[PDB]
Design a protein around this nucleic acid. Sequence first.
RNA 1: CUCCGCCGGCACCUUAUGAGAAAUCAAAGUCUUUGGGUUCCGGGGGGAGUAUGGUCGCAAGGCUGAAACUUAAAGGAAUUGA
Lengths: 202, 128, 76, 214, 70, 95, 119
Amino acid sequence: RALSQKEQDIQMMLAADVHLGTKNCDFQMERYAYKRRSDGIYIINLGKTWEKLQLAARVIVAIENPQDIIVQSARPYGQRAVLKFAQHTGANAIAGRHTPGTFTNQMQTSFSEPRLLILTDPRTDHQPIKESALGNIPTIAFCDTDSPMRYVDIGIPANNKGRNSIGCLYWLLARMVLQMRGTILPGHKWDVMVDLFFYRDP
Amino acid sequence: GRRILNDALRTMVNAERRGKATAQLQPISGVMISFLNIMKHRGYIKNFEVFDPHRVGKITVELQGRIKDCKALTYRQDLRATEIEKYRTRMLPTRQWGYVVVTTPNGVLDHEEAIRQNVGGQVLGYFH
Amino acid sequence: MQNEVGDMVDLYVPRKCSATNRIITAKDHASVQINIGHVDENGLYDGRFTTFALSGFVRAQGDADGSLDRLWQKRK
Amino acid sequence: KWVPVTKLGRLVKEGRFTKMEEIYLHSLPVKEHQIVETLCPGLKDEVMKITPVQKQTRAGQRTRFKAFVVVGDSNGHVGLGVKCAKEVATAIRGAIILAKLSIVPVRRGYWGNKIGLPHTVPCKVTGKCGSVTVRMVPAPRGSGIVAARVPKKVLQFAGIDDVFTSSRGSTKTLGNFVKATFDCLMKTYGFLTPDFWRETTFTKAPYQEFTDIL
Amino acid sequence: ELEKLKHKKKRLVQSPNSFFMDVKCQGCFNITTVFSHSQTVVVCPGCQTVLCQPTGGKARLTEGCSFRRK
Amino acid sequence: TFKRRNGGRNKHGRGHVKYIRCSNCAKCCPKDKAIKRFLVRNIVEQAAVRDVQEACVHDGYVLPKLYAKVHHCVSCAIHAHIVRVRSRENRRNRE
Amino acid sequence: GRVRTKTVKKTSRQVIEKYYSRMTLDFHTNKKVLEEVSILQSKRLRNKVAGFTTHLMRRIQRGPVRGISLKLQEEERERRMDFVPEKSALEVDEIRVDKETMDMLAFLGMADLPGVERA
RNA sequence: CUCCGCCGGCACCUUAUGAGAAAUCAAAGUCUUUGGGUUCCGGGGGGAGUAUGGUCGCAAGGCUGAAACUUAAAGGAAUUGA
Ligand SMILES: [Mg+2]
Ligand SMILES: [Mg+2]
Ligand SMILES: [Mg+2]
Ligand SMILES: [Mg+2]
Ligand SMILES: [Mg+2]
Ligand SMILES: [Mg+2]
Ligand SMILES: [Mg+2]
Ligand SMILES: [Mg+2]
Ligand SMILES: [Zn+2]
């Protein structure tokens, strides 16, 4: 036999260092930390990572109008990753600094009423999390072993500090959504190469 | 420095306010168990389970998120079946829900059972 | 709630949090309602989904995430 | 005229709601007072207090007038608005709009016997703002509203006909006193009664219902 | 598990951490029952060799002391 | 109003702490409240190090350093600018 | 004292945007070019604006630049960004992982898997 | 000396879902949805910890401790200015 979709994913995530957590583990994140190394760096349970990507994917696909989902990254590594992720699901990409007030302030030129919000890291993308808590906006976030999980509905346990990890997760997430929508047939061949998501340093 | 059934009921409220699934009650007693039966038959708690390693003994209660408050009235008054009405109004949220548990010589029971059986007794607590 | 004549007299029966059974009120703007899509067969989606509501109390605590995970573990 | 800037204001303008309770059901924030003023037809406002507050400046002291406006229809909706602006008339205008935005539903009950139209608050409820706390107790039909002038005004707009009231703290600070009553009346849906014990049946929100229109 | 981590009495059911153990020396292949937390110097009655050393915790076995929990 | 949480000194579990004499004015202040700097200085500023190493007869003599631990009271520490009035928000930084 | 204010700064960026190729490095040609793409009320202000378009276009001609979005520059950053290598550099031939990572793989049931080896 | 766990201490940091007039407080929390046990103590500001009686002390003083009268504020936390 060959590998299932899960196993190809675990192979890819294990190649992207997605399992590598940080030195700390938040008490809310401990339900995913499989164990701790002698170096003291925790290990993320890649098993649990997979269903949360599936859980996140089922939430995404039920959003009937994708332009009404927003995806964001404060850090520079997630810029190219989230920009392409939006290009393929139809979401709305907001890369860089978030203008404070874009979910609460209705007279602001930039303004929105998203039904779903996907964030690269709660610790660096704190401001949109705090804003979505004022607008009944549910939240999806990639959470490292020390991400503060306040106002976060679906936290995917995953390395979100790495150049390869961030782009790998979004590529892997965008794949799962397209399958459910039917734009990609059964049969994992998705000719969009994974390296497209990793950003380029000029 | 212990006076139990305050420790038990305050543990449940604190567990409930947080929204927990189960509570542990380290000292238990027959009085405390009979209070939980009254709570349970009225629908404010799920089942619960006694632990016997020997001792006063432990009990774990499973909470269903629909008890609002449960209190003990230490300094247990005597309560004729005639002033039930005055303790009802002071201590209960309204004339529609909520129960005052009174220990009476026909057993521990809620103030509703007390009127039907026409017994007064000594107040233990209330829940609603 | 119900008149003792038969009529129901409340306006707005509220939602309750699916994780804590707390009432979700009109001004609880931290509350969220999630729709989890159902995948069925080839293609893997039709317009069937499960709806859960989360209290603003639960999200502020941080255990919104753990509750959704433990709530989505139901089989049907 | 209107030209809405929010999804909800848009959906209200096409004429795709009947009442505020669909919005209340899913806890949407109301950011345009045009929404409430069509959905609640018989909505009555009123100024209760006009207060001047001052800050000290090198030149002198700049007065500002802060207005307290209570709005609501006397069958279960009230709002409270407060706004400070340099001129009294414009202070009231902002106060009306802030009040209409804040409309909340108020549930009622019966004193003892669930007969006829509900008239009191259902159960004991209390609210706190600052040092002032207001208590409300159910009253037999036709006890009247026994309360001070400030909370009595709020309750007539709420449609409550009978209630026993208490207070604590400095009620002479009319700001905290009117507001704590509003907190009391707001959270009457906060109380999980046995009649609400049934599992809730969910429905899609407006932002998921009228997706195609958006 | 972690019930072996929680404090002796804070466990769901109280249980002692201590145990009893059979110790054999080299100059007298007899078998001696000792307590894991002895508090008393115990000499095997046969050869008279000291067999345990009390401390603030578990009794200390010495050079040439095989033991088996029982 | 309570300006500080520690009360202006480090004293927990203790009842009494022995005082010290300020270097500048000799005001008595407790050892856990004083401003204590360990100063490591040179016998001569770098203006006059070469023209004093030109005079050392033995090659390789490194000029010794004066070691001292200087104590100050609050008023002398403020007046000399060893510590400054900080903002309310910066009052809590101990680095 | 010759700090250029908002009007000179804002117009200078904006005027380059609408007309980039049409400009040059000559201040006087830039002054003349600026004369026939706008209506202004003082020649002193014109030279100030043309003064902030001349060297600004060195720093544009030299490197990148802030809010001003140049088409020939901003397409080509996008064109070079929409790029992929000859195949995925994230390859799965050799994934060297620590024992406690393998222990996780075992707990998942995947102790044996392509290309994973203890160190 | 390095890592992990338990118990008991002196504290610290981050945060409310909490409380508070607030400053702040993980105990000043589990309070009008008000009840674990118990001791001491306050009732606008002064007069006043004064007078007097008692009592303890070598003394200095300690403990107990009013009244007549007077007065609309005194006071607490925080804000803007100067
Ligand atoms: Mg001061
Ligand atoms: Mg000590
Ligand atoms: Mg002292
Ligand atoms: Mg310790
Ligand atoms: Mg008094
Ligand atoms: Mg007095
Ligand atoms: Mg004082
Ligand atoms: Mg003051
Ligand atoms: Zn000094």
